[PDB]
């Protein structure tokens, strides 16, 4: 019996070896029920994952987009939250949230990323020692999401800390409790923005009278989860790359390496979103297997981002890797709405660390989170030297 939803398979970097085998073969593997309530098929190659997530492909996210959910066991947020909705409800929310996460919105948030990195490099610029998976990685995305939601500056530090714990190590607050506390604050913020609307995500969501208080809350949560759960590990990955890849930090400083090109390589290299699930809407043949309607199909994104048919020497971090057609942000109609924001966050992080820090050195091997939703760092012990 095979179960690819087992988190123990991905606790070590050997997950890449398992993925490499399945990606090069372009395999369709069936997983038996266990972590999944009904089981699921899986694709691994770049071409197979792109075909599953295609706009014209008869698959849906309305029942959920992660292992644990299917047609018979649907996501409770299904049809209400953007990432688990389809058709006009999905199009509406993507239209309402869209411009607040656009390239233009990302550019005005670039200053905050610089300030937040600078404030971090005020206590870690010492010799030893700091974890990069905490108080470095989660700090930047949390600050950005705060300004998107339009939270008062007075409450930012409270919200940063709760966001940090909500998507970090599972084990006196619990990540689930911290998540709840944010949603409790969200409800209080929703109430205040009903009386006095401004220029923020909460205000934009509440002005639409067709959306209920539950719809506003769930889509605020989509931005909270979306902007934090994955992004933190990409930032930690950027620090990890600067610590391991020789000459990279210097190359960014002098300008021999292109900043936007390395951002795309960090994205491909880290691939924080480990999987995306889809449910078939009609009878379809994927790869070479005939699947009925209501069948769960899963695309393993880090496997696709290291597919040798698409990426030459995929295990090496290449600062000038071109072309780089990674699907770290997924593909098709649900392509990450905050992709420009994720790119601007990484861009500024790599810039400021090249400007202020002379050398970043790794203390010991990183630990990984016991999870399947995210390819995440549990810890990254590093030494910072600058000034
Ligand atoms: C490098 C970090 C990030 C990664 C790896 C990532 C990954 C993804 C992926 C793979 C999806 C598609 C899910 C699916 O296909 O079912 C997605 C959707 C989404 N993400 Fe991101 N994301 C990142 C950063 C962000 C940021 C910064 C934001 C904004 C604050 C954000 C907000 C969203 C939203 C709102 C959706 C739903 C889009 C839709 O359903 O149309 N994400 N993300």
Which residue among 141, 221, 336, 343 is best mutated to probe the pocket of ligand 1, counting the most ligand atoms within 8 A of its Cβ? 336
Task: Put the strands of the sheet holding 357-362 in their side by side order.
Answer: 130-131, 381-386, 357-362
What the block records as the tokens of 30 is: 């069936």
- Cα(267) to ligand 1 centroid in Å equals 12
| Number of the ligand 1 atom closest to the C-alpha atom of 278 | 16
Residue 338 near ligand 1, beta carbon < 6 Å: yes
By CB neighbour count within 10 A (0-12 exposed, 13-18 middle, 19+ buried), where does 38 fall? Answer: middle
Nearest residue CA, atom 2 of ligand 1? 231
Residue 231 near ligand 1, beta carbon < 6 Å: yes
CA dist., res. 5 & res. 67, Å (int): 7
Residue 373 near ligand 1, beta carbon < 6 Å: no
The secondary structure of the chain, three-state, reads CCCCCCHHHHCCCCHHHHHHHHHHHCCCEEECCCCCCCCEEEECCHHHHHHHCCCCCCEECCCCCCCCCCCCCCCCCCCCCHHHCCHHHHHHHHHHHHHHCCHHHHHHCHHHHHHHHHHHCCCCCCCCCEECCCCCCCHHHHHHHHHHHCCCHHHHHHHHHHHHHHCCCCCCCCHHHHHHHHHHHHHHHHHHHHHCCCCCHHHHHHHCCCCCHHHHHHHHHHHHHHHHCCHHHHHHHHHHHHHHCCCHHHHHHHCCCCHHHHHHHHHHHHCCECEEEEEECCCEEECCEEECCCCEEEEEHHHHCCCCCCCCCCCCCCCCCCCCCCCCCCCHHHCCCCHHHHHHHHHHHHHHHHHHEEEEEECCCCEECCCCCECCEEECEEEEEEC
Residue 374 near ligand 1, beta carbon < 6 Å: no
How would you classify the pairing of strands 275-280 and 59-60? antiparallel
State the method: X-ray
Q: Are 33 and 39 contacting, i.e. CB atoms less than 8 angstroms apart?
A: yes
Distances in Å between the Cα of 227 and the Cα atoms of 234, 235, 247 are 11, 12, 30
Residue 270 near ligand 1, beta carbon < 6 Å: no
Nearest residue CA, atom 9 of ligand 1? 329
Q: Are 213 and 190 contacting, i.e. CB atoms less than 8 angstroms apart?
A: yes
Which residue among 105, 218, 338, 373 is best mutated to probe the pocket of ligand 1, counting the most ligand atoms within 8 A of its Cβ? 338
Q: Say how many CA atoms lie within 13 Å of 344 toward its Cβ.
A: 21
The dotted CATH code for 1-387 is 1.10.630.10
Query: How much is the CA Rg of the chain, to the nearest whole Å?
Result: 20
Binding residues for heme b: 90, 94, 278, 334, 336
Q: Give the experimental resolution in Å.
A: 2.1
Residue 341 near ligand 1, beta carbon < 6 Å: yes
| Number of the ligand 1 atom closest to the C-alpha atom of 346 | 1
Q: Are 273 and 230 contacting, i.e. CB atoms less than 8 angstroms apart?
A: yes
CA dist., res. 356 & res. 351, Å (int): 9
- Cα(98) to ligand 1 centroid in Å equals 12
| Number of the ligand 1 atom closest to the C-alpha atom of 94 | 41
């Amino acid at each position: 019996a095979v179960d690819l939803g087992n988190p123990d398979l991905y606790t070590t970097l050997e997950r890449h070896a398992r993925w490499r085998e399945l990606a090069a073969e372009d395999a369709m593997v069936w997983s038996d029920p266990g972590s999944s309530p009904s089981g699921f098929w899986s694709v691994f190659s770049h071409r197979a994952c792109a075909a599953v997530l295609a706009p014209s492909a008869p698959l849906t996210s309305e029942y959920g987009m992660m292992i644990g959910f299917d047609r018979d066991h649907p996501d409770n947020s299904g049809g209400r939250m953007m990432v688990v909705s389809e058709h006009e409800q999905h199009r509406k929310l993507r239209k309402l949230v869209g411009p607040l996460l656009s390239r233009a919105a990302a550019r005005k948030l670039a200053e905050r990323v610089r300030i937040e990195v600078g404030d971090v490099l005020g206590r870690v610029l010492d010799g030893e020692v700091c974890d990069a998976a905490t108080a470095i990685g989660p700090r930047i995305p949390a600050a950005v999401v705060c300004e998107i939601l339009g939270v008062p500056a007075e409450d930012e530090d409270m919200l940063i800390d709760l966001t940090n714990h909500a998507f970090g190590g599972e084990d006196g607050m619990t990540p689930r409790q911290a998540h709840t506390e944010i949603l409790v604050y969200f409800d209080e913020l929703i109430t205040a923005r009903r009386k006095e609307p401004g220029d923020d995500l909460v205000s934009t969501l509440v002005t639409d009278d067709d959306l209920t208080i539950d719809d506003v809350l769930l889509n605020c949560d989509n931005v909270l989860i979306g902007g934090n759960e994955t992004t933190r590990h990409a930032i930690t990955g950027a620090v990890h790359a600067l610590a391991t890849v020789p000459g990279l930090l210097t190359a960014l400083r002098d300008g021999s390496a292109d900043v936007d090109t390395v951002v795309e390589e960090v994205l491909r290299w880290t691939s924080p979103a480990m999987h995306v699930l889809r449910v078939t809407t009609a009878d379809v043949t994927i790869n070479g297997r005939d699947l009925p309607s209501g069948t769960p199909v899963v695309a393993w994104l880090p496997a696709a981002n290291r597919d040798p048919a698409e990426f030459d020497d995929p295990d090496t971090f290449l600062p000038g890797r071109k072309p780089n057609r990674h699907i770290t942000f997924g593909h098709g109609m649900h392509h990450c709405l905050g992709s420009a924001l994720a790119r601007i966050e990484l861009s500024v992080v790599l810039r400021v660390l090249a400007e202020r820090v002379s050398r970043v050195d790794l203390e010991r091997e990183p630990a990984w989170l016991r999870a399947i939703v995210v390819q995440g760092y549990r810890e990254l012990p590093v030494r910072f030297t600058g000034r």
